[PDB]
Nucleic acid binder design. Structure first.
Ligand SMILES: [K+]
Ligand SMILES: [Mg+2]
Ligand SMILES: [Mg+2]
Ligand SMILES: [Mg+2]
Ligand SMILES: [Mg+2]
Ligand SMILES: [Mg+2]
Ligand SMILES: [Mg+2]
Ligand SMILES: [Mg+2]
Ligand SMILES: [Mg+2]
Ligand SMILES: [Mg+2]
Ligand SMILES: [Mg+2]
Ligand SMILES: [Mg+2]
Ligand SMILES: [Mg+2]
Ligand SMILES: [Mg+2]
Ligand SMILES: [Mg+2]
Ligand SMILES: [Mg+2]
Ligand SMILES: [Mg+2]
Ligand SMILES: [Mg+2]
Ligand SMILES: [Mg+2]
Ligand SMILES: [Mg+2]
Ligand SMILES: [Mg+2]
Ligand SMILES: [Mg+2]
Ligand SMILES: [Mg+2]
Ligand SMILES: [Mg+2]
Ligand SMILES: [Mg+2]
Ligand SMILES: [Zn+2]
Lengths: 29, 180, 57, 235, 50, 88, 49, 46, 50, 95
RNA sequence: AUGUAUUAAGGAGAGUAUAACUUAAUUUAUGUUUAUGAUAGAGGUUAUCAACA
RNA sequence: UCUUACUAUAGUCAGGACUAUAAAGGUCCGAACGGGUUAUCGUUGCAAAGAUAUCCGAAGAACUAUGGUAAGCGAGUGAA
RNA sequence: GACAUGAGUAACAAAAAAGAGUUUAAGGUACCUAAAAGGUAUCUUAGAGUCUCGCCUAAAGCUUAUGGCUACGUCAAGUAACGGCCUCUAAGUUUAUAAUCUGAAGAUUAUGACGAUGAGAAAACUUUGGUACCAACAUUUAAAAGUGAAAAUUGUGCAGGAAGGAUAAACCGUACCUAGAAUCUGAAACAA
């Protein structure tokens, strides 16, 4: 995830990267 | 069917122009509408275009050209050139038109303003750091914003010193089969 | 200059008696106990008292 | 030398509270003038018709205002009514594409021009005390003293809202010795009738309150001929 | 007309030759910028190995 | 900034430049909810009156996109440009 | 667009009048382009002359 | 020594003396353009 | 490099491996690990095994 | 006299008779008095039809997958003048 | 650098899906062979998962 | 686009004094402007020709601006 | 090409000049406080402003040019309160035409075209040759007076002072800088 390749994406692509970090945080607990 | 003005004769059926309606300036009256138009547009064209396409009568038109800065073809490399200029047109409307007020930063969540603001801040810091370097200077270590790694090493420092935690040697620095 | 100065003679000129002198004229503030310079006011208590006399007077 | 006032509460001669600092209303700080106690003062030493109408022009982008006795303005009005507010902020001339009529004040009496010349005086004097001696906007309202000399000068040019409030005050009796009063001295006094024509109905709301002797109309004579339609609120 | 066809074929070749010169240059500018971006990942793996 | 607002006509021609009459731009999630472009094969079955009318429907749509792109940046609403480039 | 409107056929060829106003053909292609391959019989005749 | 010979210089003289039309319309100017064109210059004049 | 990453499963434009296939790792620390493909990126020719 | 002089001259850089238009088109003629008379035969108008009741939009639902036309055994499939004529006789023979 | 083959007018400006090139800036069709090729799925922007003519 | 001469179109010269003139003078004192007499400073200078004072002309063979013409076998221009 | 020496040296001195408060944003420290946060004070970076003092001032001020590696939301039918474009021409230019001359290139004369530093109707509504001329100098003149322009009147001196044409609102320019305090030329943030 690059700083510049983060705004040139759609919220669809950006929301999936947030969902991936969410499931990763749940697995750590 | 009768326009308030005198229409031309050269008919254009499939125009490829893109007209942009921009927000007015703060102190401008509500009877002034500003548009970004093609550089080949003329005052007569805007009058006809607004009436026959949007049904908007105008009493007068103002036009000014905005020049673009001279730049190198590839930013920092290449020959020096100048992009095409921008043309803005301000039409005097017969009926006033008022723009809505921009949403508040708390209501822009439909656009993901939170994530957009974080990225914008990081881009601003990056251009500021480059400006300091462009001046032939650097940020001293005393002014580095303490990151999360620094805040974590200061918390442990207080635990070992206070006696809450007993220091022990590392166990994940290297995976040796000897384990000694 | 007629010749390039050698490493021995330039180090002499830079180090012999040019060492930074340690400041030993230090004591503690009587109001907070922080380290300060002798015969000088505490910079911490100065600003704090300077502001205390600005709110209530 | 110069003597600046302070933003303290003071009494008003008008029948309204032109400012939140106004203490009282319709206060007589001086006996009536020679023409105040006159049912019909006339233009004794002025041209025929001069004073029956008073025009106000404003910059539609920056807010600079100019008062005129004729339906047009000239280069004199700009040199004599616009003080220095900063560099690149005072225009070197009048540009026809930026200056438009703001309002026109018409008195009921069609031959009492002296009443208008007085209303004109109070308007220009009030404007001078808005560009200079603006103590009521230093720490309150626009907070001109909390701004930079650049932003401060840009806000001193925006005299349009202040000008509209001056009209509501001058037409309500503001000023010492203004001929909008009519003392009978049988002692009963009242205000004279007037009509304000606006190009923008919304501009008349810069004044928090208008007097009962003024009627509002839309459209200034001469604008419809220039294909300049007025701005109405109710559409 | 035979002479009008040669006029079009000649023009089609000039524009095709111009596009190839620009495309060839652009392909090298993007390959240099991309290889430099991938080098950041190589440098990391090399620093971690040492 | 405290005057009574004027009543702007509801059927004003300039309202066709806006997607939403409160936020000039449309939310990215709703801006992507669109189909695909017409295929030449599908357009071969339309008359000049339809292709003439359909053309202008695409012009006013493009003008609506450009108007939203400009306000979204000036007002700093957030993301949505990538979603608009596909729609355009 | 609704499927019923996409599949609707409305084009009927014509022979005595062009499919669209003749003025439209000037907006589709450039009349003075050096890439024009379809010329009028008068133009070709003048070239041969 | 060098002198400030470009002080007070105008761009109307640059176009007249070194502009494109000053060269395509002369016999010696055509050579200049053809020489610079052979070398690959982008700026053929002014 | 793309053609080499799929040399064993055809060509980049004729790819005979799809998401949903069970694969086995044959390189790195996690060799002999069997998993199911979740997504497949054809630009870099990489695969995700959750 | 340095780098800036080498850039292309623009109308915003100089005065004294340097006029350069933006290809807007001639809408009339100049006079000897310094004015301009507009020729409305050169002025252009934009023919926008009535879009009331028009059901077509610039998008087609993705449930209808894209498909190209087929013309087996016809090299000039969609550009065949015979198919245009043969299709004309059957559909519209009058005009 | 030499040799072989083919060909016989060259550049620039600005703009554009930043591999895609001309305001249509990723047009629309035909034939053949498609892993024994060429040299019984998924995928129309999550695109261009096809080369030749 | 520096500079020399010429050319076309324009512009500028506080105030005072003498002289036959209200206006006729390569007249006088003296700013602007234009010169660069003398001295000092500076000399890797603020400056590859500057600073300070002093000095000279300042209605003329004057000064200035925007254009134009004339230069490199033969020499353009030159109060030299 | 890299890196030494001189050297942590010279220099940061246009004979205007500074002093003490206040405040915004971001960040760094210390304390309060250990529920994060917040508060108090201080420092760094980037700004703003108040009181006092001084310097410039027929400028180091304001408005605009030539120009511009400063920056692109700079808005005009025309006059008042505007230039260009456009019409007309000067000095000149001409790979235009004709004639002529000429080792080629080319040159000459005429005509045409182009060419401002000049001339171009009206408007606070508007569309012949001293019967002269608009070079210098002087004089007189918008009637309450004075002063400065414009234009005209009259006259003076010799050095004897253009050309030509006429007489319902497009397009281009409009931002900022003017050299003592961040922008033009001087290799540059230069005492010119
Ligand atoms: K010859
Ligand atoms: Mg304009
Ligand atoms: Mg300006
Ligand atoms: Mg086209
Ligand atoms: Mg073609
Ligand atoms: Mg020399
Ligand atoms: Mg010069
Ligand atoms: Mg400029
Ligand atoms: Mg300029
Ligand atoms: Mg010209
Ligand atoms: Mg010269
Ligand atoms: Mg003399
Ligand atoms: Mg010395
Ligand atoms: Mg003498
Ligand atoms: Mg003298
Ligand atoms: Mg030494
Ligand atoms: Mg020393
Ligand atoms: Mg020193
Ligand atoms: Mg802090
Ligand atoms: Mg004009
Ligand atoms: Mg001419
Ligand atoms: Mg001129
Ligand atoms: Mg100076
Ligand atoms: Mg400089
Ligand atoms: Mg300087
Ligand atoms: Zn202390």
């Amino acid at each position: 995830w690059s700083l510049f390749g983060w705004g040139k994406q759609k919220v669809e692509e950006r929301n999936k990267v947030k969902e991936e970090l969410k499931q990763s945080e749940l697995a750590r607990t | 069917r009768n326009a308030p003005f005198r229409v031309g004769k050269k008919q254009i059926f499939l125009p490829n122009h893109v007209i942009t309606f921009v927000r007015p300036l703060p102190k401008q009256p509500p009877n002034l509408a500003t548009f970004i138009v093609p550089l080949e547009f003329n005052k007569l064209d805007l009058r006809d275009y607004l009436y026959h396409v949007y049904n908007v009568e105008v009493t007068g038109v103002r036009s000014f050209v905005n020049q673009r800065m001279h730049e190198q073809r590839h930013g920092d490399v290449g020959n020096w050139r100048r992009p095409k200029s921008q043309k803005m047109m301000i039409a005097e409307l017969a009926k006033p038109f008022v723009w809505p007020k921009p949403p508040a930063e708390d209501a822009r969540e439909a656009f993901d303003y939170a994530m957009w603001k974080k990225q914008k801040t990081a881009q601003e810091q990056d251009t500021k750091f480059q400006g300091i370097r462009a001046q032939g200077e650097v940020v001293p270590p005393s002014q580095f914003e303490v990151t999360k790694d620094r805040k974590a090493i200061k918390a442990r420092q207080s635990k070992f010193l206070s006696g809450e935690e007993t220091w022990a040697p590392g166990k994940v620095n290297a995976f040796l089969n000897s384990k000694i | 200059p007629k010749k390039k100065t050698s490493h021995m003679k330039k180090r002499h000129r830079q180090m012999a008696g040019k060492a930074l002198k340690d400041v030993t004229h230090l004591n503690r503030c009587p109001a907070c106990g922080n380290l300060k310079r002798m015969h000088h006011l505490c910079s911490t208590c100065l600003g704090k008292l300077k502001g205390f006399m600005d709110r209530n007077g | 030398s110069t003597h600046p006032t302070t933003a303290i509460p003071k009494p008003t001669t008008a029948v309204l509270k032109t400012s939140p600092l106004a203490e009282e209303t319709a206060v007589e700080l001086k006996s009536p003038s020679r023409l105040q106690l006159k049912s019909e003062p006339g233009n004794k030493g002025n041209p025929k018709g001069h004073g029956d109408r008073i025009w106000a022009f404003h910059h539609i982008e920056q807010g600079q205002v100019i008062y005129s006795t004729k339906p047009v303005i000239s280069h004199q009005h700009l040199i004599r009514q616009q003080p220095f507010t900063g560099k690149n902020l005072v225009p070197r001339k009048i540009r026809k594409d930026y200056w438009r009529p703001l309002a026109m004040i018409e008195l009921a009496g069609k031959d009492q021009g002296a009443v208008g010349r007085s209303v004109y005086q109070k308007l220009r004097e009030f404007k001078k005390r808005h560009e200079l001696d603006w103590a009521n906007e230093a720490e309150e309202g626009r907070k001109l003293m909390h701004k930079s000399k650049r932003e401060r000068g840009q806000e001193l040019n925006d005299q349009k809202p202040n000008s509209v409030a001056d009209m509501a005050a001058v037409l309500a009796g503001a000023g010492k010795g203004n001929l909008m009063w009519q003392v009978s001295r049988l002692v009963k006094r009242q205000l004279r009738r007037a009509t304000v024509y606006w190009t923008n109905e919304q501009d008349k709301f810069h004044a928090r309150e208008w007097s009962d002797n003024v009627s509002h109309e839309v459209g200034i004579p001469g604008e419809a001929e220039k294909k300049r339609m007025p701005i109405r609120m109710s559409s | 007309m035979d002479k009008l066809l040669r006029r079009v074929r000649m023009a089609e070749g000039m524009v095709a030759r111009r596009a190839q010169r620009k495309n060839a240059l652009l392909k090298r500018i993007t390959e240099r910028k991309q290889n430099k971006k991938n080098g950041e990942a190589f440098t990391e793996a090399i620093q971690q190995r040492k | 900034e405290e005057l009574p607002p004027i009543q702007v006509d509801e059927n004003h021609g300039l309202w066709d430049f806006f997607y939403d009459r409160e936020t000039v731009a449309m939310a990215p999630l709703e801006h992507t909810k669109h189909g695909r472009a017409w295929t030449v094969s599908e357009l071969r079955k339309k008359s000049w009156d339809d292709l003439h009318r359909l053309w202008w429907v695409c012009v006013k749509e493009r003008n609506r996109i450009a108007t939203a792109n400009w306000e979204r940046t000036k007002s700093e609403l957030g993301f949505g440009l990538a979603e608009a480039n596909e729609r355009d | 667009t609704l499927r019923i409107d996409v599949d609707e056929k409305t084009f009927v060829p014509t022979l005595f009048r062009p499919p669209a106003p003749q003025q439209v053909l000037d907006e589709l292609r450039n009349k003075y382009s050096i890439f024009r391959t379809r010329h009028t019989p008068e133009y070709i005749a003048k070239k041969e002359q | 020594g060098p002198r400030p010979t470009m002080s007070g210089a105008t761009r109307l003289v640059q176009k007249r003396r070194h502009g494109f039309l000053s060269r395509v319309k002369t016999k010696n100017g055509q050579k200049t353009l053809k020489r610079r064109l052979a070398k690959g210059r982008l700026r053929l004049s002014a | 490099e793309r053609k080499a990453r799929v040399a064993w499963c055809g060509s980049p434009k004729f790819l005979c491996i799809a998401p949903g296939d069970r694969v086995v790792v044959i390189e790195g620390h996690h060799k002999d690990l069997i998993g199911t493909i979740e997504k497949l990126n054809t630009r870099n020719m990489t695969v995700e095994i959750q | 006299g340095l780098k800036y002089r080498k850039l292309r001259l623009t109308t915003k850089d100089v005065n004294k008779g340097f006029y350069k238009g933006n290809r807007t088109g001639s809408m009339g003629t100049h006079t000897s008095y310094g004015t301009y008379k507009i020729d409305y035969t050169k002025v252009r108008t934009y023919v926008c039809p009535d879009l009331t009741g028009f059901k077509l939009t610039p998008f087609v639902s993705k449930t209808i997958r894209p498909v190209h036309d087929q013309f087996p055994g016809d090299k000039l499939g969609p550009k065949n003048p015979a198919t245009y004529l043969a299709r004309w006789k059957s559909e519209n023979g009058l005009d």
